[PDB]
Amino acid sequence: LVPVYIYSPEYVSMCDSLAKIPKRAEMVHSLIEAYALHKQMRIVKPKVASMEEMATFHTDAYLQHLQKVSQEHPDSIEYGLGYDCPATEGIFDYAAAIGGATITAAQCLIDGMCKVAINWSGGWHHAKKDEASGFCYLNDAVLGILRLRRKFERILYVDLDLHHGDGVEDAFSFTSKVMTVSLHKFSPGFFPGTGDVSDVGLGKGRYYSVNVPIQDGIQDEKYYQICESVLKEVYQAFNPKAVVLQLGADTIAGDPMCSFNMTPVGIGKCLKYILQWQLATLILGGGGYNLANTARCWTYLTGVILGKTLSSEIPDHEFFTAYGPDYVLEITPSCRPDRNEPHRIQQILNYIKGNLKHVVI
Numbered sequence: 001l002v003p004v005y006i007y008s009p010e011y012v013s014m015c016d017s018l019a020k021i022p023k024r025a026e027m028v029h030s031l032i033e034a035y036a037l038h039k040q041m042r043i044v045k046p047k048v049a050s051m052e053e054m055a056t057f058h059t060d061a062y063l064q065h066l067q068k069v070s071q072e073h074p075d076s077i078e079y080g081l082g083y084d085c086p087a088t089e090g091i092f093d094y095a096a097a098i099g100g101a102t103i104t105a106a107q108c109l110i111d112g113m114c115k116v117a118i119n120w121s122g123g124w125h126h127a128k129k130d131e132a133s134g135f136c137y138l139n140d141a142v143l144g145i146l147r148l149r150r151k152f153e154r155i156l157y158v159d160l161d162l163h164h165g166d167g168v169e170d171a172f173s174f175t176s177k178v179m180t181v182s183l184h185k186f187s188p189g190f191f192p193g194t195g196d197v198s199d200v201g202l203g204k205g206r207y208y209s210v211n212v213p214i215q216d217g218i219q220d221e222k223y224y225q226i227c228e229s230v231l232k233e234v235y236q237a238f239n240p241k242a243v244v245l246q247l248g249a250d251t252i253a254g255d256p257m258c259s260f261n262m263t264p265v266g267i268g269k270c271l272k273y274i275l276q277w278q279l280a281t282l283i284l285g286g287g288g289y290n291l292a293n294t295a296r297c298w299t300y301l302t303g304v305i306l307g308k309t310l311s312s313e314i315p316d317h318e319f320f321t322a323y324g325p326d327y328v329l330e331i332t333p334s335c336r337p338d339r340n341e342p343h344r345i346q347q348i349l350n351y352i353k354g355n356l357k358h359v360v361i
């Protein structure tokens with residue numbers, strides 16, 4: 001009955017070893033531990049993904065290339081490697097560990113071990129079947145969804161990262177077995193450039209992709225209003241049997257991305273709404289580039305999952321000195337404008353409502 005927490009010291013070390021910002025996984029776990037939340041979860045060591053498991057989504061050619069350059073290359077550009085996804089030593093084992101962790105969480109859900117399974121180091125939603133993209137070498141979210149398909153006939157993917165979950169959406173673009181829902185910043189020039197409200201999927205999957213384009217400066221109340229409106233309609237139209245939820249913390253006030261203006265409490269309300277469906281739910285991380293705030297956020301959301309109220313004071317622990325200048329759990333929104341016009345937002349919601357009328361289970 002208690003949530004599964006995917007964790008080992010070795011796994012955290014691997015996640016941080018080639019993370020864009022060092023020590024993020026270690027800081028997230030360290031804060032969860034400082035609040036003693038791990039004592040209220042079932043700690044499960046991740047299994048590393050086998051080649052065959054990774055190939056449920058990724059092509060053999062891409063996987064073999066990743067494996068080769070990871071060992072100590074003219075093809076690497078073809079596979080999306082070189083810039084934001086460097087071809088450095090060890091990336092294949094790294095990626096296989098995160099993929100395996102998400103698959104392990106999914107397997108726990110299939111086996112009925114728990115109703116919620118957490119991999120805060122997963123959520124790499126941009127990777128394509130045959131190329132790295134947007135810091136993502138492997139798409140662990142797709143791998144988790146495909147593991148859940150061994151049991152569940154309809155899976156809802158909900159992506160609350162600042163960025164469009166394009167890799168996951170594209171993986172399931174042509175099918176009605178998986179509905180993808182992404183709330184994200186959408187503005188010409190802003191990565192990855194896709195996911196306008198008119199993006200609804202293709203072929204047999206038409207209307208089984210939902211995209212909510214949002215502008216800079218959104219705060220908790222308006223975001224939750226949008227999220228609840230969409231998820232209410234989605235739940236009613238699609239009747240999912242399991243959920244995968246990406247909770248990238250790069251929406252949170254104080255992130256270097258400096259785009260949305262959320263706090264973990266607003267994201268938490270979204271999470272609570274999904275949890276009250278009482279479905280098998282796979283919880284993932286994602287972006288998040290202010291280390292202390294990302295730990296604040298995912299620790300608070302772990303508390304939400306556990307139904308616990310955490311002390312506002314950051315406990316004494318290894319990374320306490322990183323939590324200045326205030327040393328509290330709460331995050332204060334930045335003093336900058338909300339650029340979301342309410343009639344634009346309502347227009348987007350109206351479109352989505354119209355699209356979901358076509359969804360016929």
Ligand SMILES: Cc1cc(Cl)ccc1OCCCC(=O)NO
Nearest residue numbers: 084134135161163191250287288
């Ligand atoms: C910030 C950034 C810089 C470069 Cl050079 C290329 C891509 C970038 O953004 C990727 C954002 C990754 C993310 O958080 N996705 O959810």
Ligand SMILES: [K+]
Nearest residue numbers: 159161163183
């Ligand atoms: K998103």
Ligand SMILES: [K+]
Nearest residue numbers: 172175178208
């Ligand atoms: K779909």
Ligand SMILES: [Zn+2]
Nearest residue numbers: 161162163287
């Ligand atoms: Zn992101």
